């Protein structure tokens, strides 16, 4: 999410205006002014693609933030930007993992953060852990670490 949101923050107004013009083609004639699998399929086929209904549903689900089953303009911008080393972080992961258990816990994160020399607030520590810990177990596993440092 975070890396895509940042890309969105950095689109110019004219870029967003052009994307709006494209979005209007997609949603032409849609009941609720949004893109369903019906509109998405129609445009993909117009473009020469032949997605299955499952691929279409998956394209929508990837960016659907309100569980509407449909794509609004904000979700469309994310879809657009989405359209366009590990060995190295594996060695670095090991350096965080001081008790060698295969997870980075809060203590280990704290130790590393203090070692940076920057002034580390409690908020710095809690938010970084929440940012890294996708499955709410309070620690950062290897796959979470890769996304965290992507």
């Amino acid at each position: 999410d975070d890396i895509y949101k940042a890309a969105v923050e950095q689109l110019t107004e004219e870029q967003k205006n052009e994307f709006k013009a494209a979005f209007d083609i997609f949603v032409l004639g849609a009941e609720d002014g949004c893109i369903s699998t019906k509109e998405l399929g129609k445009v993909m086929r117009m473009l020469g693609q032949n997605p299955t209904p499952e691929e279409l549903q998956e394209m929508i689900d990837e960016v659907d933030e309100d569980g509407s089953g449909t794509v609004d303009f904000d979700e469309f911008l994310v879809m657009m930007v989405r359209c366009m080393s590990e060995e190295e972080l594996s060695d670095l992961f090991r350096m965080f993992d001081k008790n060698a258990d295969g997870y980075i816990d809060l203590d280990e994160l704290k130790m590393m953060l203090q070692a940076t020399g920057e002034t580390i607030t409690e908020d710095d520590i809690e938010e970084l852990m929440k940012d890294g810990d996708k499955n709410n177990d309070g620690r950062i596993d290897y796959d979470e670490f890769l996304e965290f440092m992507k």
Partner: protein, 108 residues
């Protein structure tokens, strides 16, 4: 503030790995030292060629031994990867914009 994180992650690549490679330049002349051919006569050269060929055999055997351990770890990695998996159980916007909007696509 997270996008400062991406900068420092990029510096860390741009990093330690490079220093470790260098620390390898230091390791390497420490095992394979320079040849000394100057002043060896014909017979001495024949013997050297036999000596080197024998060394080729020995080094290949040592390489094989490390390779065999690597192979056994692959088997273990493949098995553990299956185990943890069980326990845990287009077109670019560019091309699209050109097609839909034609000339009106400039910025995107």
């Amino acid at each position: 503030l997270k996008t400062l994180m991406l900068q420092i992650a990029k510096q860390e690549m741009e990093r330690e790995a490079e220093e470790r490679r260098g620390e390898k330049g230091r390791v390497l002349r420490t095992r394979c030292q320079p040849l000394e051919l100057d002043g060896l006569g014909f017979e001495e050269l024949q013997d050297l060629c036999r000596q080197l060929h024998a060394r080729v055999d020995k080094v290949d055997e040592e390489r094989y031994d490390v390779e065999a351990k690597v192979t056994k770890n692959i088997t273990e990695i493949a098995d553990l990867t299956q185990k943890i998996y069980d326990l845990r159980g287009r077109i670019s916007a560019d091309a699209m914009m050109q097609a839909l909007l034609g000339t009106r696509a400039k910025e995107s």
